[PDB]
Amino acid sequence: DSCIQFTRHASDVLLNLNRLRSRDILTDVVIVVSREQFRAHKTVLMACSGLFYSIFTDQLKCNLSVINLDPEINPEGFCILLDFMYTSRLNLREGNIMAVMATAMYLQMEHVVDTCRKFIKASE
Amino acid sequence: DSCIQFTRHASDVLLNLNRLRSRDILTDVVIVVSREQFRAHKTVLMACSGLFYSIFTDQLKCNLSVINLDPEINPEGFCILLDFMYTSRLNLREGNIMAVMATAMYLQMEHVVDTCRKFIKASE
């Protein structure tokens, strides 16, 4: 086509989706990770994660308002990844890298798994 | 903070939101523009448009599944803008620029109004 493109559009959309999440506006699911609860938008979760894409395209699970993750999933690791989904920013640290990588593997977030593997290989 | 950022993340999220829209997955509103209907995600509309941000933060309108636009709104102009919301790409042409600008003004999409004004000024 003969379209023009607005460079910052995708980033501005994501910034606004994060603002809606922070104000709990039109959030439609709560992700339970052991004792912790995280409110989010199903569409954003599906757009970032192979696991959520599978869950919310399921004819029964698409209608659930609560999703319980595997008890081995670390809430801080999930929180870091949920923040990444809504911002493109990953708070990767020596103290959390193992939890972040394990959570990214479970959530099926290949690019995160890739940078975690690379950061781990550099430290050995 | 000491975060790392994934450059393509925002663009990949938007590409997936558009794929969900094309397959009518978790769309939660239909925008009626005279004889035409457009299914979309309320969160994406709010993230792109001052008018939809106002409508869906309203305590009554947030729960509506159908929104009827002003009868002066051109469906093709709306379609071009809805595509822009989900892709960052604006199909701006001599034959549609007036309709696109009028629709962008109504929808409160300042960056689109700005490029339409600039393209119009260059042709006079």
């Binding site: 379209c3 023009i4 493109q5 607005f6 460079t7 | 790409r89 604006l90 960056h111 490029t115």
Partner: peptide, 4 residues
Amino acid sequence: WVIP
């Protein structure tokens, strides 16, 4: 705005 750019030509993509």
